[PDB]
Design a protein around this ligand. Structure first.
Ligand SMILES: [Cl-]
Ligand SMILES: [Cl-]
Ligand SMILES: [Xe]
Ligand SMILES: [Xe]
Ligand SMILES: [Xe]
Length: 162
């Protein structure tokens, strides 16, 4: 299992623009398009990402690309977020993926807001940090997802995804 396999599981796959759980225009594998309510903005934006007039629809390949770019940026973000770099680096490989999923889902920012857990996570306090993570708007809004992730983080295995 890996980062791509993992997020493919958590975000699914849609070839047509859709709204997330948040009500936001999205497509592909978790490719947020715009916080705006304008479906039009949203198609502009798809078109712009894609490089053509999609008319609101992309191919598998197209989704796979946005996805590739999206994971890449995530890792690159992490690695450049000075609060984030050092946690990430301290982690084993499973756990890294967990940090990247989270970042892919809520942004460097939002993630940067798990300071408290992020520090116990830094300090190898698996369970302690996992319980703190649960006390978050993030956990309450997408419990099931959130769970697979605080599990993977805490355990350092992929069990939650098997
Ligand atoms: Cl883009
Ligand atoms: Cl969920
Ligand atoms: Xe975290
Ligand atoms: Xe955790
Ligand atoms: Xe966490």
């Amino acid at each position: 299992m890996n980062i791509f396999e993992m997020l493919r599981i958590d975000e699914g796959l849609r070839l047509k623009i859709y709204k997330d759980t948040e009500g936001y225009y999205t497509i592909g594998i978790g490719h947020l398009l715009t916080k705006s309510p304008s479906l039009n903005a949203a198609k502009s934006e798809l078109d712009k990402a894609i490089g053509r007039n999609t008319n609101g629809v992309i191919t598998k390949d197209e989704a796979e690309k946005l996805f590739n770019q999206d994971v890449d940026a995530a890792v690159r973000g992490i690695l450049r977020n000075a609060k984030l770099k050092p946690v990430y680096d301290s982690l084993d490989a499973v756990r890294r993926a967990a940090l990247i999923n989270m970042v892919f889902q809520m942004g460097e920012t939002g993630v940067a807001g798990f300071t408290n857990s992020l520090r116990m996570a830094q300090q190898k306090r698996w369970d302690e940090a996992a319980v703190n993570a649960a006390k978050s708007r993030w956990y309450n809004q997408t419990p099931n997802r959130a769970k697979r992730v605080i599990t993977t983080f805490r355990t350092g295995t992929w069990d939650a995804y098997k």
